[PDB]
Structure 1
């Protein structure tokens, strides 16, 4: 932990570009695992309706499937509006 300080000092004195590149790359690898917004990005990607939602044939045993888009059932995107 003491010699690494001298090594970093020498690298910064001689090769600032390499030090900057390595720092930026290391941040790029490690930061996304520690961020709480990557889940939000995944859900935003999942909430984009590229495809037509094919309706389900009613059998009388779906309490959680809406009959109309304005019905309270189904997923809600209110989290996206406030995001």
Structure 2
């Protein structure tokens, strides 16, 4: 714990470029696993409608599927407007 401090000081005094590069790379590696907004990025990617949504045939037993785009059923994007 004491020799590595001297090593870090010497690296900062002799090769600052490599010190900055390693610090930036380590932050870029480890930070995304600790962020709560990564799942927000996943949801935003999933909410982009590239293709046409093909309707399902009504068999009379799907109360979770809306009968109209403005019906209360189906997914909501209200979380996206507050972001």
Q: TM-score, normalised by structure 2?
A: 0.99
Deviations 1:21-71 (A, max 9, x none): 000000000000000000000000000000000000000010100000000
List alignment gaps of at least 5 residues for structure 1: none
RMSD of the alignment, in Å?
0.3
**Alpha-carbon separation, structure 2, partners of 1:3 and 1:20:** 20
Runs of 4+ in 1 over 6 A off after TM superposition: none
**Alpha-carbon separation, structure 2, partners of 1:4 and 1:58:** 68
Deviation, 1:9, is 0.2
Greater length-normalized contact order (CA 8 Å, ≥ 6 residues apart)? 2
**Alpha-carbon separation, structure 2, partners of 1:69 and 1:5:** 62
Q: TM-score, normalised by structure 1?
A: 0.99
Aligned length: 83
**Alpha-carbon separation, structure 2, partners of 1:60 and 1:75:** 20
